[PDB]
Ligand binder design. Structure first.
Ligand SMILES: Nc1nc2ncc(CNCCN3CCC(SC[C@H]4O[C@@H](n5cnc6c(N)ncnc65)[C@H](O)[C@@H]4O)CC3)nc2c(=O)[nH]1
Length: 158
């Protein structure tokens, strides 16, 4: 099954956090990374005094069930998501979202797939379009069409 995963980090210098999360993703059992989008720098949703986000998409081949993949992504956020802030551990700055899991539709307490808000987020849709331009959602909407219809601005690379 091909799962598409969104990575975001809003650390001032997020490259090494993002690199560590990609390494950890590739170490998930019965799984392996097929492709990684470029890294994009996007303004934060809301207050603009806040730090920019680094966003990327990852294609991961996996034979895990969806909630097992989620357990791994949540473990990775716990282990890698916090950077040492001199005298103490900083806030969580890394997000890992499951955007798609094969052609599955999932609505449980833990998991909504396709991701509940990705259709509104250029910073999710554009990196996904880089690695999967012909992508079709389970309901038959085409990724290309959603971008064409909403005309989100293209993103700057980090
Ligand atoms: N420029 C830019 N601005 C941004 N502004 C705001 C944000 C906000 N963080 C996105 C991650 N936010 C918040 C934390 C919750 S975390 C709660 C819960 O979400 C549940 N969940 C349900 N479906 C899920 C799924 N498909 N993938 C993963 N978790 C799933 C899960 O059980 C968890 O307990 C997951 C969704 N990001 C960006 C960004 O990047 N870029």
């Amino acid at each position: 099954t091909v799962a598409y995963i969104a990575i975001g980090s809003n650390l001032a210098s997020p490259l090494e956090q993002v690199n560590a999360a990609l390494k950890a993703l590739g170490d998930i059992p019965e799984s392996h990374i097929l492709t990684v989008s470029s890294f994009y720098r996007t303004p934060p949703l809301g207050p603009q005094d806040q730090p920019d986000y680094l966003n990327a998409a990852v294609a991961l081949e996996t034979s895990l069930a969806p909630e097992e993949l989620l357990n791994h992504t949540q473990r990775i956020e716990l282990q890698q998501g916090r950077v040492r802030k001199a005298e103490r551990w900083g806030p969580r700055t890394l997000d890992l979202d499951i955007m798609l899991f094969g052609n599955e539709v999932i609505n449980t307490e833990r998991l909504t797939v396709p991701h509940y808000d990705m259709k509104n987020r250029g910073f999710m849709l554009w990196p996904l379009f880089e690695i999967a331009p012909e992508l079709v959602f389970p309901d038959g909407e085409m990724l290309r069409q959603i971008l064409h219809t909403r005309a989100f601005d293209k993103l700057n690379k980090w």
